[PDB]
């Protein structure tokens, strides 16, 4: 598809089983994930947001559809106030910006 | 043009004279840049993610360059760690997102 930006870019993900809303994210290295089980060992990450360092839980290898396409990535898990997919798993995706 | 994702979309902006490196983030509702002088009045405001919230003063109807492309609208300056163009200005160049 082509998604503007005149609104937040919202999708619908699934993960675990489960649909979630998750915002399209251009300016994140990684993708981040609110509280939830997810299968396998973790390793702690240290994302650099705006107002801040903040430690997550790095999860490899995780199966996750986005908007129907289907990714297998890294998704960190933590305290984030939206889900976000980013770089790594938009690049999955072949998701690029265009004007 | 059409910019990949294998690293952070970085582009070059004019404003206020200056020449700035900035991030194309779609998950920013909000323009923030560094430290640096704007024109009229300013009103401050909070603006946050996941690492927290810094205060910013907000300059409305500034002109901007993004990559070539001329936008006006608010621009949000603070104590940001990297200048980020968000939604507010993405849109006005035509920028979307495709896959
Ligand atoms: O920390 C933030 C952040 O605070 N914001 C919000 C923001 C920042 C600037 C202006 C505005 O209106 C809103 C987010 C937005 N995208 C990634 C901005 N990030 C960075 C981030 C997030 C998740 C994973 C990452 O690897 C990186
Ligand atoms: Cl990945
Ligand atoms: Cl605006
Ligand atoms: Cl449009």
């Given amino acids: ?6 609104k937040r870019p919202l999708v619908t993900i699934k993960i675990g089983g489960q ?11 990684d993708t981040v994930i ?8 973790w390793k702690p990450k240290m994302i650099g947001g705006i107002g801040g360092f903040i430690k997550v839980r790095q999860y490899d290898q995780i199966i996750i559809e ?25 690049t999955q995706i072949g998701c690029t910006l265009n004007f």
Avoid: F, Y
């Fill in 66 to 90: 986005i908007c129907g396409h289907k990714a297998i990535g890294t998704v960190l898990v933590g305290p984030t106030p939206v889900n976000i997919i980013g770089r790594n798993l938009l």
């Fill in 19 to 29: 649909l979630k809303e998750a915002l399209l994210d251009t300016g994140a290295d």
């Fill in 34 to 41: 609110e509280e939830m089980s997810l299968p396998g060992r």
């Fill in 1 to 6: 598809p082509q998604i503007t930006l005149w």
